[PDB]
Design a protein around this ligand. Structure first.
Ligand SMILES: CCCCNC(=O)c1cccc(NC(=O)CCCCCNc2ncnc3[nH]cnc23)c1
Length: 245
């Protein structure tokens, strides 16, 4: 039975779609966490109030080092509060912008962590949609954490979304490419060109992308969703094996 006065509120972490997220301390435990505040009126205007309840119910049963932990949740009358794990090292997107690109070791390790988290949920009959780098947070140990509401931008959508269990495989291909190159593979100057690139699966590798990486990405980025390299096969990939930590 959590209440708002059980928490001391610190700095805002960022503005979002339905509200704000803050650094916070639970008063009894002195534990550092993130409190996500979502306004009910905005959820009602979008018509996602029931969707959020079902989402939060799923996440409350998910316990994996590479999925952001939901410790609990509560409401008052106008706001919905989510008690979330705090990630001290920020987003993977920000890390990518700072370095411009990741090396093979970091890329393979992130993909392994993603595949592990998605495989864990698969055994619990839980599926994920598209994955964005801004929704991947980094813990103190340098481990990636999936932090979104996709448990059940055009640049990250598969051809079928422009769909069921195989969306996340396309996402892994896009992310692996972006981690190594610094930009998503279907990046274009217009919406129409970006749409065409995705639908026709038209992407190219710069010269610095190694053959092992190219093989992994090409097996992932297929129009035929059922023929995409699966989570088990990704973890078993020669390039992943050789480069993951
Ligand atoms: C899909 C729609 C629902 C909602 N999400 C939101 O409305 C929403 C509300 C507030 C913020 C955001 N996201 C953002 O503003 C993304 C920017 C990143 C902020 C840093 N966030 C965190 N840094 C470290 N540890 C954490 N644990 C949980 N979050 C964090 C999103």
């Amino acid at each position: 039975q959590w209440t708002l006065e059980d928490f001391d509120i610190g700095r805002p972490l960022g503005k979002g779609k339905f509200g704000n997220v803050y650094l916070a301390r639970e008063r009894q435990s002195k534990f550092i966490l993130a409190l996500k505040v979502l306004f009910k009126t905005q959820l009602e205007k979008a018509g996602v109030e029931h969707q959020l309840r079902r989402e939060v119910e799923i996440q409350s049963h998910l316990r994996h080092p590479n999925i952001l932990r939901l410790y609990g949740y509560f409401h008052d009358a106008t706001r919905v509060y989510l008690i979330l794990e705090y990630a001290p090292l920020g987003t993977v997107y920000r890390e990518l912008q700072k370095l411009s690109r990741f090396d093979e070791q970091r890329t393979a390790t992130y993909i392994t962590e993603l595949a592990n988290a998605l495989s864990y949920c698969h055994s619990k009959r839980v599926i994920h949609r598209d994955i964005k780098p801004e929704n991947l947070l980094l813990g103190s140990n340098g481990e990636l954490k999936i932090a979104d509401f996709g448990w059940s931008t055009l640049d990250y959508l598969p051809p079928e979304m422009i769909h069921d269990e195989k969306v996340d495989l396309w996402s892994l291909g896009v992310l692996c490419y972006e981690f190594l190159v610094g930009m998503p593979p279907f990046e274009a100057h217009t919406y129409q060109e970006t749409y065409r690139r995705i639908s026709r699966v038209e992407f190219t590798f710069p010269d610095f992308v190694t053959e092992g990486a190219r093989d992994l990405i090409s097996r992932l980025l297929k129009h035929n969703a059922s023929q995409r390299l699966t989570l088990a096969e990704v973890l078993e990939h020669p390039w992943i094996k050789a480069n993951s930590s």
